Design an enzyme around this catalytic site. Structure first.
Site, PDB file in Angstrom:
ATOM      1  N   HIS A  98       0.744  -1.255   0.000  1.00 45.56           N
ATOM      2  CA  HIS A  98       0.000   0.000   0.000  1.00 45.56           C
ATOM      3  C   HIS A  98       0.781   1.317   0.000  1.00 45.56           C
ATOM      4  O   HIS A  98       0.189   2.385  -0.148  1.00 45.56           O
ATOM      5  CB  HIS A  98      -1.014  -0.009   1.149  1.00 45.56           C
ATOM      6  CG  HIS A  98      -2.375   0.478   0.750  1.00 45.56           C
ATOM      7  ND1 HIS A  98      -3.516   0.168   1.459  1.00 45.56           N
ATOM      8  CD2 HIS A  98      -2.779   1.238  -0.296  1.00 45.56           C
ATOM      9  CE1 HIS A  98      -4.562   0.713   0.867  1.00 45.56           C
ATOM     10  NE2 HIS A  98      -4.143   1.369  -0.201  1.00 45.56           N
ATOM     11  N   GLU A 100      -1.564  -5.280  -1.794  1.00 46.45           N
ATOM     12  CA  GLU A 100      -1.227  -6.254  -0.762  1.00 46.45           C
ATOM     13  C   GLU A 100      -1.386  -7.746  -1.072  1.00 46.45           C
ATOM     14  O   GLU A 100      -1.561  -8.553  -0.163  1.00 46.45           O
ATOM     15  CB  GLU A 100      -1.964  -5.911   0.541  1.00 46.45           C
ATOM     16  CG  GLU A 100      -1.631  -4.529   1.129  1.00 46.45           C
ATOM     17  CD  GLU A 100      -0.163  -4.342   1.506  1.00 46.45           C
ATOM     18  OE1 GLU A 100       0.618  -5.314   1.441  1.00 46.45           O
ATOM     19  OE2 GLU A 100       0.214  -3.208   1.877  1.00 46.45           O
ATOM     20  N   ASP A 135      -7.200  -2.350  -0.331  1.00 45.48           N
ATOM     21  CA  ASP A 135      -6.225  -3.216   0.329  1.00 45.48           C
ATOM     22  C   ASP A 135      -6.980  -4.539   0.520  1.00 45.48           C
ATOM     23  O   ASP A 135      -8.028  -4.569   1.169  1.00 45.48           O
ATOM     24  CB  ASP A 135      -5.831  -2.630   1.682  1.00 45.48           C
ATOM     25  CG  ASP A 135      -4.739  -3.432   2.379  1.00 45.48           C
ATOM     26  OD1 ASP A 135      -4.542  -4.617   2.031  1.00 45.48           O
ATOM     27  OD2 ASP A 135      -4.086  -2.877   3.290  1.00 45.48           O
ATOM     28  N   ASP A 155      -3.721   2.957   7.906  1.00 44.12           N
ATOM     29  CA  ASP A 155      -2.530   3.322   7.135  1.00 44.12           C
ATOM     30  C   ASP A 155      -2.203   4.803   7.259  1.00 44.12           C
ATOM     31  O   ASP A 155      -1.794   5.439   6.293  1.00 44.12           O
ATOM     32  CB  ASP A 155      -2.742   2.957   5.668  1.00 44.12           C
ATOM     33  CG  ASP A 155      -2.664   1.467   5.434  1.00 44.12           C
ATOM     34  OD1 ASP A 155      -2.521   0.718   6.426  1.00 44.12           O
ATOM     35  OD2 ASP A 155      -2.740   1.040   4.265  1.00 44.12           O
ATOM     36  N   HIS A 206      -6.921  -1.623   8.069  1.00 44.44           N
ATOM     37  CA  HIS A 206      -6.050  -0.671   8.752  1.00 44.44           C
ATOM     38  C   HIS A 206      -6.258   0.756   8.242  1.00 44.44           C
ATOM     39  O   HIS A 206      -6.736   0.964   7.130  1.00 44.44           O
ATOM     40  CB  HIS A 206      -4.582  -1.072   8.554  1.00 44.44           C
ATOM     41  CG  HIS A 206      -4.316  -2.526   8.790  1.00 44.44           C
ATOM     42  ND1 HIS A 206      -4.521  -3.486   7.822  1.00 44.44           N
ATOM     43  CD2 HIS A 206      -3.918  -3.193   9.900  1.00 44.44           C
ATOM     44  CE1 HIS A 206      -4.264  -4.682   8.327  1.00 44.44           C
ATOM     45  NE2 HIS A 206      -3.897  -4.531   9.587  1.00 44.44           N
ATOM     46  N   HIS A 227       4.118   1.093   4.398  1.00 44.70           N
ATOM     47  CA  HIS A 227       2.832   0.757   3.795  1.00 44.70           C
ATOM     48  C   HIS A 227       1.710   1.054   4.787  1.00 44.70           C
ATOM     49  O   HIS A 227       0.531   0.951   4.457  1.00 44.70           O
ATOM     50  CB  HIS A 227       2.776  -0.706   3.347  1.00 44.70           C
ATOM     51  CG  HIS A 227       2.776  -1.695   4.469  1.00 44.70           C
ATOM     52  ND1 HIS A 227       2.447  -3.022   4.285  1.00 44.70           N
ATOM     53  CD2 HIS A 227       3.088  -1.565   5.780  1.00 44.70           C
ATOM     54  CE1 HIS A 227       2.557  -3.665   5.433  1.00 44.70           C
ATOM     55  NE2 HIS A 227       2.945  -2.804   6.357  1.00 44.70           N
ATOM     56  N   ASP A 239      -6.441  -7.026   2.415  1.00 48.29           N
ATOM     57  CA  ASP A 239      -6.547  -7.563   3.768  1.00 48.29           C
ATOM     58  C   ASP A 239      -7.779  -7.032   4.495  1.00 48.29           C
ATOM     59  O   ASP A 239      -7.946  -7.252   5.693  1.00 48.29           O
ATOM     60  CB  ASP A 239      -5.261  -7.309   4.578  1.00 48.29           C
ATOM     61  CG  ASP A 239      -5.054  -5.856   4.949  1.00 48.29           C
ATOM     62  OD1 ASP A 239      -3.892  -5.489   5.239  1.00 48.29           O
ATOM     63  OD2 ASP A 239      -6.032  -5.086   4.975  1.00 48.29           O
ATOM     64  N   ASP A 249      -9.790  -0.885   3.690  1.00 51.76           N
ATOM     65  CA  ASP A 249      -8.693  -1.507   4.414  1.00 51.76           C
ATOM     66  C   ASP A 249      -9.104  -1.862   5.840  1.00 51.76           C
ATOM     67  O   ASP A 249     -10.002  -1.237   6.412  1.00 51.76           O
ATOM     68  CB  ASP A 249      -7.570  -0.475   4.470  1.00 51.76           C
ATOM     69  CG  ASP A 249      -6.217  -1.076   4.715  1.00 51.76           C
ATOM     70  OD1 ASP A 249      -6.091  -2.002   5.533  1.00 51.76           O
ATOM     71  OD2 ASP A 249      -5.265  -0.581   4.094  1.00 51.76           O
TER      72      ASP A 249
HETATM   73 MN   LIG Z   1      -3.278  -0.902   3.576  1.00 49.17          MN
HETATM   74 MN   LIG Z   2      -4.464  -3.293   5.529  1.00 48.18          MN
END
Ligand SMILES: [Mn+2]
Ligand SMILES: [Mn+2]
Ligand SMILES: [Mn+2]
Ligand SMILES: [Mn+2]
Ligand SMILES: [Mn+2]
Ligand SMILES: [Mn+2]
Lengths: 310, 310, 310
Positions: C102, C276, C231, C129, C127, C142, C233, C125
């Site tokens: 990312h 990712e 992303d 980030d 997260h 990332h 994930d 995402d």
């Molecule tokens: Mn990310």
């Molecule tokens: Mn992530």
């Protein structure tokens, strides 16, 4: 923010050994650190030696009264939990009880309600755990707590349970996640008009609406304290594998924790039981971690953990 | 409450052997006991010998008409199912047909609709099963029932299907769970304005709303009989592994059964087909049990089984 | 319908090798064919040699500024992506960037926004980030793109990032699927009032409502262009296993693609990043296929693929 983590390593309400390891396993994953980290002044409360109890339980096959298994051992241990949970609540501390099988709810619910008489009880379970003494086929007491608490089948409840205070009324119990209710229990919930939300309601209305309905059901003035007795087998075996009575089609991991967030959000949770974690009932040591971590996750979410800023 | 469990061990509408074992496997798990246990006076109806048919099918590679495979064998077997399902319905009994691949729907839908002319049809499948004779690329007839039933591509349907009554109209078909529709089928559903609810609608509105929309779509006066042809591959492979044409992103186990409960609740279900269970298409004998049990679960939920008191 | 598939095989924003294989793997599964098949005039845009970069990255441990790791390499590569994405957009072509970790969003967001200044950014995402240079504990870039893009902790951002245009404002960012936000990031989202929709909102309102809320949040006049940085994930590890930072309790496969359909439906998507995907982080070559196929599926759904007729 005072809390007492009540350790109840009991397995007498059922046949499988390993469930009494829940407390130990949970505390290993850092249950207390999480709680302190959430701002709670924690204190561990051991009510009895899990090793000794397993010893006296394993041997004594004579502890039975017809179908009911180990009523003497169960009555003795749950009375200790009652006294401990009652004391914890009187001191004004929040009792977080870690089991141990669900028969421990005899002491937790009795203890909390004898201090907060108008407290509602939200029973998160795939099962109704309301089999009467005469009704229970398997005779396992972890499937009978609510019958004894509600004082059902009075005449057939062993006198060794004479200590159980009659503090729970049917209009103060609400189920969430039901999907393995037997015929006797179906009739009981219906005749007693107990607010029960099966997986059908979750699938139909969604977990958010169900939780709201459950909290309302046991909260007349909408301001009563709320207690949650959380049986982990309410969550689909996919996520909670290591458990004694799994039932397919349960709550997803997300729903299992969202429910907790809604109750936390509520602001009236006065007690919580997290039961049925049996580490010895897993193939990979991965099933064990998935299960136990889910337990700690329930505790954190119930006690304040949020995904965003708060 | 009279029921006829129609056994249709047919696999001619597709290439994989094993799907004809569905009836046997389902009855092994106690399909009939469950039905009787649900209050239905059951009777098994064998339409033909699955072993003989597999024999004549396996050998005869010459049974083809261009792209279409085994039109002779398929036309002969589905006509027997038609006659059996037609008879079962005329006697006023509920026809529960267990397949067998989905090509059997040629006889079930034809049989039920020729008795209940205004019956709606809810096709629960990841696929549209509406490829025309000229359109079908693979030539497998389990993906062509609805084209023949609706009388599409008339001119190219073999005369060995001349027995098929033209009783199904496009405004009486509603799909649920669609996610693997090919270009030809997309155009057809669109040009014919067939009520189709893809996984997109489920994800968007939820299964409860989709079912309601589906039942409404084929129920003008809102009082017409309803028939459900249930292809198990509508359910995500995660839960229904042993099946010929799996497609990722399907109904969860919960949605698969909630749908059944809503239809049961409806009170107008007049027939049900449960198809595409191929026990011979599983790695662990666990995949087989997951699949077959899901089948029996659909039958129980469709026929009355509820999680709570009723 | 002109498109430029920007290949960004970069892994400098994190420690695991393999993520730079995403572009190659995606194109192997037929990413470009799918796009052309969807009516897009496609063109591949290689910004740099993934093999060379991995070489210079692997060796050079000295590339660090305190906690931050590889700021020199990251700043150099993301500036090339910026220039390429900026050029692609100026030519009026749709930039579909495939990562790569990312950290590449530094160039994609900068490139797209410097051409479409009022473009909203939907960050899908688990997260946030948004760790600042001083805040990042792991030092992996990332997990820091948004802090640099928003120009946070200005004083501590290496001068090798002086090329980054200050085009992203906090009211133009909306998160979807958040569930692993750290304390620093929680405070930031809160102090900056950034529209963030965690798994809590998804569980509470459903993915359809969340997407609508996200698109609204970054679309004042309700007509602004929209960019999505996806992303993988964000999707539950169950479906997206091969990835560097998995987090339990994510979007189901269905929600992951429904989200894409809603954005596609929107009609204002002006750019997309899919990041990712680390094929080298899987046990079975099945995990790899599950992951990479999910990537191509996101691209197809974002770019027009529907389950039914359109
Ligand atoms: Mn990310
Ligand atoms: Mn992530
Ligand atoms: Mn229980
Ligand atoms: Mn239970
Ligand atoms: Mn089918
Ligand atoms: Mn199908």
């Amino acid at each position: 923010k005072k809390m007492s983590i009540v350790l109840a390593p009991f397995s007498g309400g059922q046949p499988h050994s390993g469930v009494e390891l829940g407390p130990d396993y949970l505390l290993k994953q850092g249950l207390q650190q999480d709680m302190e980290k959430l701002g709670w002044d924690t204190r561990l409360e051991r009510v009895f030696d899990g090793k000794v109890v397993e010893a006296r339980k394993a041997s004594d096959n004579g502890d039975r009264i017809g179908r009911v298994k180990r009523p003497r051992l169960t009555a003795e241990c749950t009375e200790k939990i009652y006294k401990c949970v009652r004391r914890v609540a009187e001191q004004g501390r929040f009792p977080l009880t870690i089991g141990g099988d669900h028969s421990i709810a005899l002491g937790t619910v009795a203890g909390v309600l004898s201090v907060h008489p108008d407290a509602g009880v939200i029973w998160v379970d795939a099962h109704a755990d309301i089999n009467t003494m005469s009704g229970t086929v398997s005779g396992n007491l972890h499937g009978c707590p609510l019958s004894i608490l509600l004082g059902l089948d009075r005449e057939n409840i062993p006198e060794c349970f004479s200590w159980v205070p009659q503090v729970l009324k049917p209009n103060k119990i609400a189920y969430i996640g039901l999907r393995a209710v037997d015929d006797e229990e179906k009739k009981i919930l219906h005749d007693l008009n107990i607010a029960a939300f099966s997986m059908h309601h979750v699938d139909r209305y969604g977990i958010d609406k169900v939780v709201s309905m459950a909290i309302e059901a046991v909260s007349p003035k909408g301001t009563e304290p709320v207690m949650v007795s959380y049986d982990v087998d309410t969550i689909d075996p996919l996520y909670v594998p290591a458990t004694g009575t799994p039932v397919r089609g349960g709550l997803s991991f997300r729903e299992a924790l969202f429910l907790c967030e809604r109750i936390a959000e509520c602001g009236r949770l006065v007690a919580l039981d997290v039961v049925e974690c049996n580490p010895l009932l897993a193939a990979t040591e991965s099933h064990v971690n998935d299960t136990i971590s889910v337990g700690c996750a329930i505790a954190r979410c119930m006690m304040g953990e949020t995904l965003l800023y708060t």
